Every structure is written in structure tokens, then in C-alpha cells.
Design a protein. Structure first.
Ligand SMILES: NC(N)=NC1=[SH]CC(CSCC/C(N)=N/S(N)(=O)=O)=N1
Ligand SMILES: [Zn+2]
Length: 256
């Protein structure tokens, strides 16, 4: 699977029938149809920069993974009773500035989107166990609006020249990804899925109302990562965003 004409989002259902399921992500958040939910607590993140582990070129994207053997780095609050353990963050982006985010807000497409993913360590003993459970994953998404260069992206951007081609990986340490979150954590929440195979309907989404910035030249660094292995002809990672999927009657809730 990928994001090409032949292996891309509109082909995924051939191998992953859940792609046409009832809790698929991302979605368009229509703000006139969201229902403010007064029981939603504030989102609380508390991450230890010592859990940051490694950065990896996974061919369609790159991931920054964290040690997840204990509760040094956790998400609590929001719609959750359980505490969720941080395991990764990564980005999605598009061919040009005009699209690139996965979620849209009232039809508006942003330039990129940051996903900070976590697994339910109150209920499950590993990411592998949690990843297929209805309540197993909690992902914060933050919409990225093209404009001013974002300095908090810096350590991440500087690391990519060491993982230029598919399968390359490098240590990436002492990094607290709450520094990338917008100053207000007001959010939307809905029940959905991983946005690429295997597309498990295991994700509680937490979408921030406030965007963060990214420059047109920062976006170019993402798109200059390569999806081919070292020594093959260079294939730029131009985009990795899935189109928005039908709500199928789920309700998007607002904390604000
Ligand atoms: N199979 C297995 N044992 N563990 C798995 S399968 C996918 C997975 C999460 S990695 C995160 C990749 C992703 N698509 N998340 S997103 N874009 O935030 O919806 N862990
Ligand atoms: Zn993602």
C-alpha cells in the first residue's frame, strides 16, 4: 500500500475492507454540527523528554518513536478515564501548500497535520494489544497552517538529513513533543481510526481548535525525504494525506 495512483487511499479497501467502515478517519469537522459536551475535562499532557528514542524513515512518512515501558509520558483528561501512554509522533503533508492536512474544518484544508499517538496502558499491556481495541489508541491531531517558520520544528527538521531514504533510522533523544502543541488545547473529539493501513477503528481523536504554523520551506523539507532505499533512483515523498471519510452518523463533540 502507499499513496500512489495504484496503491493509494481509493485502492486500500481491496486489501483492507475496513476502509469503508463506519468509524474511518480523517473527517471534515462541520462546526455548526458539533455538540458542545460539558463533561469533557481539559486535555492534560505530561511528557518526559528522556522517553524520546529514534527517528525512522518508513518509506511513506517518518516517525519519531518514544520508549513506552512505563508512564513517564502520558495523556490524561479530555474524554478519557484511563491514562494513555505516548508512543510516537509523525506528520502528514500534501503535494503543494494548498492541501496536506488529513482532517478539514468546515471544508478548509490545511498544509500539514501533526499526530501525537498514545496507547491505553490502563487497560492493555502493549501497543500491539491496544492497537486493534475500540478504546486502545488516543491521537492528538494539530492542523498546520502555512505561514511563518515554526522554530519548535527545528530539532525534527535538522534530524531528517540522517534518514533520507527508506529504512534509515537514527537516535533522537531528549525531546518533549508537548512543545509542538498550540497554546490552547481546546479540542474536538470523535471515535475513529488509524488513517492508513491497517485502518483499525481503535482511535479516539483529539483535534485541536488552534492551528500551529509551518513555512513553505519547512514543508519542502518533508517533501524532500525519499521513499526509495539508498542507491535506487530518488522518489520524493510528495504527499501522505488520506481524503476525509463519511461520518456515518458519528457525532463530533466540542470541549469549547
Ligand atoms: N499492528 C500492530 N501491532 N501495531 C500497530 S498497527 C498500527 C499502529 C500504529 S502506528 C501509527 C500509524 C498510523 N496510521 N496512525 S494515525 N496516522 O495517527 O492514524 N500500531
Ligand atoms: Zn497520522
Amino acid at each position: 500500500w502507499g499513496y500512489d495512483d495504484k496503491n493509494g487511499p481509493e485502492q486500500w479497501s481491496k486489501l483492507y475492507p475496513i476502509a469503508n467502515g463506519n468509524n474511518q478517519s480523517p473527517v471534515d469537522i462541520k462546526t455548526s454540527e458539533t455538540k458542545h459536551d460539558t463533561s469533557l475535562k481539559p486535555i492534560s499532557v505530561s511528557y518526559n523528554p528522556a522517553t524520546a528514542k529514534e527517528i525512522i524513515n518508513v518509506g511513506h512518512s517518518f516517525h519519531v518513536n518514544f520508549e513506552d515501558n512505563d508512564n513517564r509520558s502520558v495523556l490524561k483528561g479530555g474524554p478519557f478515564s484511563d491514562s494513555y501512554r505516548l508512543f510516537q509522533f509523525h506528520f502528514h503533508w500534501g503535494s503543494t501548500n494548498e492541501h496536506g492536512s488529513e482532517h478539514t474544518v468546515d471544508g478548509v484544508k490545511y498544509s500539514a497535520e501533526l499526530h501525537v499517538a498514545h496507547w491505553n496502558s490502563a487497560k492493555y499491556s502493549s501497543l500491539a494489544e491496544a492497537a486493534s481495541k475500540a478504546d486502545g489508541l488516543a491521537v492528538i491531531g494539530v492542523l498546520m497552517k502555512v505561514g511563518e517558520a515554526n522554530p519548535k520544528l527545528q530539532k525534527v527538521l535538522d534530524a531528517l538529513q540522517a534518514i533520507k531514504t527508506k529504512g534509515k533510522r537514527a537516535p533522537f533523544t531528549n525531546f518533549d513533543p508537548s512543545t509542538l502543541l498550540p497554546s490552547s488545547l481546546d479540542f474536538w473529539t470523535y471515535p475513529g481510526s488509524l488513517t492508513h493501513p491497517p485502518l483499525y477503528e481503535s482511535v479516539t481523536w483529539i483535534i485541536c481548535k488552534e492551528s500551529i504554523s509551518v513555512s513553505s520551506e519547512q514543508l519542502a523539507q518533508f517533501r524532500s525525504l525519499l521513499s526509495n532505499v539508498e542507491g535506487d533512483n530518488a522518489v520524493p515523498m510528495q504527499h501522505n494525506n488520506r481524503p476525509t471519510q463519511p461520518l456515518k452518523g458519528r457525532t463530533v463533540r466540542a470541549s469549547f
